[PDB]
Amino acid sequence: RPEPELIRQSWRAVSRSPLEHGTVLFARLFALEPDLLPLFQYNGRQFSSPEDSLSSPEFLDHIRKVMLVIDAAVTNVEDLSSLEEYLASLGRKHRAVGVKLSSFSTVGESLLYMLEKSLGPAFTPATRAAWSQLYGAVVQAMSRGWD
Numbered sequence: 001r002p003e004p005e006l007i008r009q010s011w012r013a014v015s016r017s018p019l020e021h022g023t024v025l026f027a028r029l030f031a032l033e034p035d036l037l038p039l040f041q042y043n044g045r046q047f048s049s050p051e052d053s054l055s056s057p058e059f060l061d062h063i064r065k066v067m068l069v070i071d072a073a074v075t076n077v078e079d080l081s082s083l084e085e086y087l088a089s090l091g092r093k094h095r096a097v098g099v100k101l102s103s104f105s106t107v108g109e110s111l112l113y114m115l116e117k118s119l120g121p122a123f124t125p126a127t128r129a130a131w132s133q134l135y136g137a138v139v140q141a142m143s144r145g146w147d
Ligand code: HEM
Pocket: 036, 039, 040, 041, 058, 061, 062, 065, 066, 067, 069, 070, 090, 093, 094, 097, 099, 103, 104, 107
């Protein structure tokens, strides 16, 4: 369904520097949902600022994890069904720590923003639709974990 090449070629722009792009995504995510900032708990305590967390090792490591899972959706775009069981367990893991499934819609909005910022006009209507469809499928798979 999602045109693989549109997904792959657009992803290569951000996958180059995952951490930098990941930050852009999370900055927009925290602006859309401030309530997420506290959900990051290290060996106790959290982050005073959106910006303070962007210094935490755990938090940066999480950026990387997020981008790796999006990378898996890209390398499995021609057969996302294979990822279903992994994403369901990932969904459960997030439910376990207090994240609401609805927050993953915000992540999607944030992902598109990150792509808009990086690609500009190269982020075409067709590319945008492909991403909405891909990410929508990822989140559908993850929703199996809220059981
Ligand atoms: C919606 C906002 C999100 C919040 C508040 C959140 C929060 C967390 C927290 C607290 C952890 C446990 C600590 C850690 O392992 O770093 C975690 C783990 C993880 N998250 Fe997220 N997360 C969010 C979105 C995402 C997204 C969109 C993805 C990718 C699809 C993702 C991928 C992962 C992975 C791969 C792990 C490690 C799972 C494991 O321990 O096996 N997270 N997340």
